[PDB]
């Protein structure tokens, strides 16, 4: 069985040298493989070919910070001076023809996170229900969380200062420039909306808490 | 400037069929082997089909052999993937890729989403969102993905940020925003254009003061 094994995730500090490993099944230890890169919400792209002897060929436009090397069954992708845009999923692949048959296999991919980037507290933009949606017995409050780094944030909502649970939907954070952004929706009957003093979107980020409230009126 | 643009992705019922196309430019199409690679919701990549430059030879993995047919029309610089007997496990983002003399998948397209499911398509309910000023546009309760959101028919370039959809009750909801100098804010017209291909529905929603 032609199989490529890669760890699912890995973390490195900005500026450090990273090394990712792709391991060929033993019987295929002499195989040349390919490395691919896939940045958040984007198409995968070709990085390089890597032979058993460690010689490799890089794709057009790949930074020279990316290089390959090998050791027996292991195939390594090394990234010197790791940068924020190197944050991505890296996948190895390998092909072979058995008689007149072609098989091509990809590894499971390694999600790479770049730590130690400059912190940036999140901005909150809140919108109340549209008049049209209210005309339908419903109200969705939208909270756009933007300009933050790192990506971990915990969103909560408050109705008249009290924490709400049932009815909240927050997206996962998403890359944008060097920053991150996400959204959160609080689903309300049109009634609750105009019958509460306030609503609050609360975001916790790296020890800090940001809040911006909406007032029906 | 090598370019590959896939189209044809859509909602299909299990047991159904669907044909994808990939339009190519910026290179000599008829000189290269072309392939399809798909990416499932778990993010894993799977090679789907490869065809030689003249179309004489085709290759497929067991997972789709007999069900999927890759073909091409060199006179039209187009690559095709006819799919049949689809199953829910086939749902995925399908990409077209072109070889180099030294590697298999050197240039990739943007991808086209194939969703295989019994659920029917639901168009989105689009609502404007009103407060440099930041306006929004709520795109609620659609299926399947994707939807595209532009502003003033694409005139409002930067300042625009469409957020990732959230999934609740087998339906998706997302939001998009544009920031614009406060001068034109209400004086000029600002509208979001929402397209949900799966339903052939397109809606331009005017952003109006509350």
């Amino acid at each position: 069985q032609l199989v490529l094994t890669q760890s699912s995730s890995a973390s490195f500090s900005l500026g450090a040298s990273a090394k990712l490993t792709c391991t060929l099944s033993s019987q295929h230890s002499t195989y040349t493989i390919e490395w691919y890169q896939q940045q958040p919400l984007k198409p995968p792209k070709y990085v390089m070919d890597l032979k058993q002897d460690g010689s490799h060929s890089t794709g057009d436009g790949i930074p020279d910070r990316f290089s390959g090397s090998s050791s027996g069954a292991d195939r390594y992708l090394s990234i010197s001076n790791i940068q924020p845009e190197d944050e991505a999923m890296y996948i190895c692949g390998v092909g072979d023809t058995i008689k007149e048959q072609f098989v091509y296999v990809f590894g499971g991919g390694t999600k790479v996170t770049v730590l130690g980037e400059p912190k940036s507290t999140p901005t909150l933009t809140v919108f109340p229900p549209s008049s049209e949606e209210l005309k339908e017995n419903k109200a969705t409050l939208v909270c756009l969380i933007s300009n933050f780094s790192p990506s971990g944030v915990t969103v909560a909502w408050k109705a008249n200062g009290t924490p709400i649970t049932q009815g909240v939907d927050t997206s996962n954070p998403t890359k944008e420039g060097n920053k991150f952004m996400a959204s959160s929706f609080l689903h309300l009957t049109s009634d609750q909306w105009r019958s509460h003093n306030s609503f609050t979107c609360q975001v916790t980020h790296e020890g800090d808490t940001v809040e911006k409230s909406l007032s029906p009126a | 400037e090598v370019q590959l643009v896939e189209s044809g992705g859509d909602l299909v019922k299990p047991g159904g069929s669907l044909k994808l196309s990939c339009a190519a430019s910026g290179f000599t199409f008829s000189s290269y082997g072309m392939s399809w690679i798909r990416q499932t919701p778990d993010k894993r990549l799977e090679w789907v089909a490869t065809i030689s430059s003249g179309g004489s030879y085709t290759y497929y993995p067991d997972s789709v052999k007999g069900r999927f047919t890759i073909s091409r029309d060199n006179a039209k610089n187009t690559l095709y993937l006819q799919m049949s007997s689809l199953k829910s496990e086939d749902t995925a983002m399908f990409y077209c890729a072109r070889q180099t003399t030294m590697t298999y998948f050197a240039y990739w397209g943007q991808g086209t989403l194939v969703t295989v499911s019994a659920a029917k398509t639901t168009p989105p309910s689009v609502y404007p969102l009103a407060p440099m000023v930041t306006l929004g546009c709520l795109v609620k309760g659609y299926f399947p993905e994707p939807v595209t959101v532009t502003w003033n028919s694409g005139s409002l370039s930067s300042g625009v940020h469409t957020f990732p959809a959230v999934l609740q009750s087998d339906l998706y909801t997302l939001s998009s925003s544009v920031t614009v100098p406060s001068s034109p804010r209400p004086s000029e017209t600002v509208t979001c254009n929402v397209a949900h291909p799966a339903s052939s529905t397109k809606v331009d929603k005017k952003i109006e003061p509350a």
Partner: peptide, 18 residues
């Protein structure tokens, strides 16, 4: 190196249809 040679040949075949 054997697989690396099957690889080169196959990539050439896709181009030239040997």
């Amino acid at each position: 190196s054997i697989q690396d040679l099957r690889r080169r040949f196959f990539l050439h075949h896709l181009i030239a249809e040997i």
